Amino acid sequence: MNIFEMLRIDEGLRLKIYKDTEGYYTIGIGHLLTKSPSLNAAKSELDKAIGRNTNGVITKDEAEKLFNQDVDAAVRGILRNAKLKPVYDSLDAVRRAAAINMVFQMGETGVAGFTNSLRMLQQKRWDEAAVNLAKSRWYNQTPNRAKRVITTFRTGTWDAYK
Ligand SMILES: [Cl-]
Numbered sequence: 775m776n777i778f779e780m781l782r783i784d785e786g787l788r789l790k791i792y793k794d795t796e797g798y799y800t801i802g803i804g805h806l807l808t809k810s811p812s813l814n815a816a817k818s819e820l821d822k823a824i825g826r827n828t829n830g831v832i833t834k835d836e837a838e839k840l841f842n843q844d845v846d847a848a849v850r851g852i853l854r855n856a857k858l859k860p861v862y863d864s865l866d867a868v869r870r871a872a873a874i875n876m877v878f879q880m881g882e883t884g885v886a887g888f889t890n891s892l893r894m895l896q897q898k899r900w901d902e903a904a905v906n907l908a909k910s911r912w913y914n915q916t917p918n919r920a921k922r923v924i925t926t927f928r929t930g931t932w933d934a935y936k
Pocket residue numbers: 823
């Protein structure tokens with residue numbers, strides 16, 4: 775297992791514009807288009823993203839292209855962030871995958887708000903970080919996914935994904 779397979783499990787793959795768990799226009803493998811309530815706004819963001827007139831539909835290749843860009847962007851957002859970077863550097867490779875998952879889902883600003891959790895992760899107090907991560911809107915809105923990610927941070931194995 776790896777970050778790409780992990781995220782593919784948590785996000786799914788849809789080839790036509792859909793609304794994510796928050797109600798926002800999304801396509802592909804969790805690629806958020808726009809928070810605007812306008813489907814026309816989403817269609818236009820989509821055309822711009824893919825570089826052609828999509829009419830709200832993309833191919834599998836195109837979905838995987840956005841996905842690659844989004845994983846890369848998430849990683850680069852962690853490394854450029856002064857609060858995320860030292861935690862990520864402290865982690866082993868499996869738990870690094872859990873951090874990228876979170877940034878992918880909620881953005882670098884969102885994750886950098888998990889100040890207490892990040893400190894416990896850095897000190898490698900795994901059971902305590904897992905308890906603190908769960909006291910969150912994230913965990914209450916999307917518990918099955920949050921549980922899988924939290925378990926990954928707790929154990930440093932892919933057991934929640936197997
Ligand atoms: Cl894009």
